Amino acid sequence: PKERPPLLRLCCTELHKENPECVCSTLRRAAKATRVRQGTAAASQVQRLFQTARHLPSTCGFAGVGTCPFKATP
């Protein structure tokens, strides 16, 4: 299908509730929350977790933002 997965579309709707200059900070907070709640510790999983979050503005048509910059993972 050319439409995106429904869960990704719901995520994009939620992101659109924020200002562009808040998106990367809130996605970092979301990534830390998932990492901690789900106890994700395998190195490749942790890296992919934070990378996925940083790319969501570009997965979600936030043209002004682009990809969020890398920040060292806690």
Partner: protein, 35 residues
Amino acid sequence: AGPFGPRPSCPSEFVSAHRLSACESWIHSEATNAG
């Protein structure tokens, strides 16, 4: 910048956006696909 500008409050926007709960589920789903 002024006292009556838009003045975004990112933590308030985060909670108003359900803490991006759908993005959290998506991020989790992608993370466990690693390797």
